[PDB]
């Protein structure tokens, strides 16, 4: 078990700093180096800095270079990143990631090896960047009009994400909810659908419960045929 | 200037070998230059070149197919031969038979099919043959519509003619359904003059070859 | 070995209008690369070789170019007898590798089907299955909707379609939909209809009998 | 003692033996696998070694 959990992260307003912590456990001695990558939803994975034994990095990436700072406390076992003077693209799941160097490399255990591949990845902490201010969503149904489609369209939220389920989750079959979209304005939307048997429609209740937690907001909505 | 006619069983059940004849006429399999061809295309899939055989003994099999396909020409029977070994549900595809000509300023050797033949369907299925039952489409501002329904049958295909190849203006014969039992089905319906019902004879003939069934239906009103 | 990425994957086109496919291999094969056409159930036949030769029978309206890595199939006015799958190919090196083809539809005038019912045949209820079979004949575009309706309560999952290829003359489609029921259900209701709708028919189109008349 | 004498034969050539005795004839003809048409029996290529140690 070499796992590591990322804590913090969350909303912040651009210009300001948040630093996020990586608590180091399992095979992991901490004399071995250690890196975040970030990734924003709807974008590749971008590296951004690694650290080694002590003082050896000093190793940010050209977008952080003024910005991020590298910690680490071997005393806790734990990898930090303060992020300062954050934009507006710095919105993305950072990512702790292990280093690991081949053993030809790294002559001195603590220093640095300038050649690291990431083997094992943890779970990730989001953290968005805007002006916005948290929202909970408005839920319009998607009515009905052998196999009918239906559902509820979740509108003008902030931040991500939403939970959709359908009949308290006794719905599954043929349940798509899709991927959010973020409007001008700055709030997302998405939908969720359902697909059912026509005749289903008259005896069976459909209520799609939607959970934005950012705001502790929770609805039922129940789609009718109209 | 040559014709090229494919056969062999239609359903083949896993693990088992694949054999395949094409009946060539027009030209002799002896021939130092042509080549002859099988190329396959799984249902909704690509083609997929199987190899080529020479008169002379030189072949090329797809590495892909290569060690479990073999080719050979009977020269007695003026037909060439596909065998494919242990095979499983990835075979199930049209096999084409196919002609090309030694070509070098061209084409790369034996890489040219330029005369196929029209395919045969193999099945690779544990599934047993069934032969069809077959009912008619009897007829209700001028026209008229009739056919045959040609009911659970196992594998494809079948083969419709109305009158023997006599009755072909205005023929539909429609794609099989696989139905939830696992048996096929499909129609075949013709135009006519309504002022024809009263008069004119109509039999479908629904052939299959796998249960070596033929049946006739002659259609009229109920 | 040679990967050959044939694109558009399909297309639609009027008649008389200019066609182009393109197909571009994995490596550089020079002119060593083949087209062939496959209309529905027939031989697939070699249209042009080695890049731009035009094979016998083939109209002038098609013509190969390219080499190296880029080819070209153009069909200069599109006929009705061109619907077919279109594929290229490479001769340059073992095994022949073909692309995954590219099929070419017709665009013509809207054309509205002609429905037909046909009841189940008295000699299949003894084997204890009825079949109504539901005709559209020659109709253009492909979406035709059936329903099927029984003393007038909506079916559902109790019937399949299945649709010709387009028509290599007058580039229509047809369709059967086939209701299929116990015989003991069958003879528990009495009306049986099909309801087409599609865009060549102004409002939707019932053909009906009833049973036992 | 027997010695052996072999040769390399062109597709579609004749090898002529002629002898009034002290002949050892062969009854089979070896054929090598790299020159093989793809019909399965080819198995193209090998690497001939020289060596002391077991196999793994």
């Known amino acids: 078990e070499v796992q590591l959990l990322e804590s913090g992260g969350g909303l912040v307003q651009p210009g300001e700093s948040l630093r996020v912590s990586c608590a180091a456990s399992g095979f992991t001695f901490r004399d071995s180096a250690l890196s975040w990558v970030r990734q924003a939803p709807g974008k590749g994975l971008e590296w951004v800095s690694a650290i080694s034994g002590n003082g050896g990095a000093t190793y940010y990436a050209d977008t952080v270079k003024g910005r991020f700072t590298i910690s680490r406390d071997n005393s806790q076992t734990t990898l930090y990143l303060q992020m300062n003077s954050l934009r507006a693209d710095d919105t993305a799941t950072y990512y702790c990631a292990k280093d690991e160097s081949p053993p030809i490399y790294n002559l001195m255990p603590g220093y640095y090896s300038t050649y690291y591949y990431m083997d094992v990845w943890g779970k990730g902490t989001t953290v968005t960047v805007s002006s916005a201010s948290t929202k909970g969503p408005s839920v319009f149904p998607l009515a009905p009009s052998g196999t009918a489609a239906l559902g509820c369209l979740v509108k003008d939220y902030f931040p991500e994400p939403v939970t959709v389920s359908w009949n308290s989750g006794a719905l599954t079959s043929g349940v798509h909810t899709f991927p959010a979209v973020l409007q001008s304005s700055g709030l997302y939307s998405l939908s969720s659908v359902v697909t059912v048997p026509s005749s289903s429609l008259g005896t069976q209740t459909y209520i799609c419960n939607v959970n934005h937690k950012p705001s502790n907001t929770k609805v039922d909505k129940r789609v009718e045929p109209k | 200037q040559v014709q090229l006619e494919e056969s062999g069983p239609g359903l083949v059940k896993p693990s088992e070998t694949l054999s395949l004849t094409c009946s060539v006429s027009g030209v002799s399999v002896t021939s130092d230059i042509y080549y002859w061809t099988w190329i396959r295309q799984p249902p909704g899939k690509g083609l997929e070149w199987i190899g080529y055989?020479?008169?002379?003994?030189?072949?090329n099999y797809n590495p892909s197919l290569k060690s479990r396909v073999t080719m050979s020409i009977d020269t007695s029977k003026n037909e060439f031969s596909l065998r494919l070994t242990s095979v499983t549900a990835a075979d199930t595809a049209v096999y084409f038979c196919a002609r090309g000509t030694e070509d070098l300023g061209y084409c790369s050797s034996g890489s040219c099919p330029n005369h196929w033949g029209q395919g045969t369907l193999v099945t690779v299925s544990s599934a047993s043959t069934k032969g069809p039952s077959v009912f008619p489409l009897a007829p209700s501002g001028g026209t008229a519509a009739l056919g045959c329904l040609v009911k659970d049958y196992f594998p494809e295909p079948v083969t419709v003619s109305w009158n023997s190849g006599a009755l072909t203006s205005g023929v539909h014969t429609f794609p099989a359904v696989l139905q939830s039992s696992g048996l096929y089905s499909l129609s075949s319906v013709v135009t006519v003059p309504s002022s024809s019902l009263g008069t004119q004879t109509y039999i479908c003939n629904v052939n299959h070859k796998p249960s070596n069934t033929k049946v006739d239906k002659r259609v009229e009103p109920k | 070995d040679i990967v050959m990425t044939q694109s558009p994957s399909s297309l639609s086109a009027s008649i008389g209008d200019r066609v182009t496919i393109t197909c571009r291999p994995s490596q550089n094969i020079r002119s060593f690369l083949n087209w062939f056409q496959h209309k529905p159930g027939k031989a697939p036949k070699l249209l042009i070789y080695?890049?731009?030769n035009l094979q016998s029978g083939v109209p002038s309206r098609f013509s190969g170019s390219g080499s190296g890595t880029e080819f070209t199939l153009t069909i200069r006015s599109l006929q009705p007898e061109d619907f077919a799958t279109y594929y290229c190919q490479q001769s340059y090196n073992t095994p022949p590798t073909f692309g995954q083809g590219t099929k070419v539809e017709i665009k013509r005038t809207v054309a509205a089907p002609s429905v037909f019912i046909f009841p189940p045949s008295d000699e299949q209820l003894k084997s204890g299955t009825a079949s109504v079979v539901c005709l559209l004949n020659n109709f253009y575009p492909r979406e035709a909707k059936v329903q099927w309706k029984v003393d007038n309560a909506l079916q559902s999952g109790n019937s399949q379609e299945s649709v010709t290829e387009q028509d290599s003359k007058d580039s229509t489609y047809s369709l059967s939909s086939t209701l299929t029921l116990s015989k003991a259900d069958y003879e528990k209701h009495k009306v049986y209809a099909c309801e087409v709708t599609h865009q060549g028919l102004s409002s939707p189109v019932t053909k009906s009998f009833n049973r036992g008349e | 003692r027997i010695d052996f004498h072999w040769m390399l034969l062109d597709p579609g050539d004749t090898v002529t033996f002629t002898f009034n005795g002290a002949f050892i004839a062969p009854d089979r003809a070896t054929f090598l696998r790299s020159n093989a048409p793809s019909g399965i029996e080819y198995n193209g290529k090998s690497l001939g070694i020289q060596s002391d140690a077991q196999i793994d």
């Open positions: 055989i020479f008169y002379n003994g030189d072949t």
């Open positions: 080695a890049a731009s």
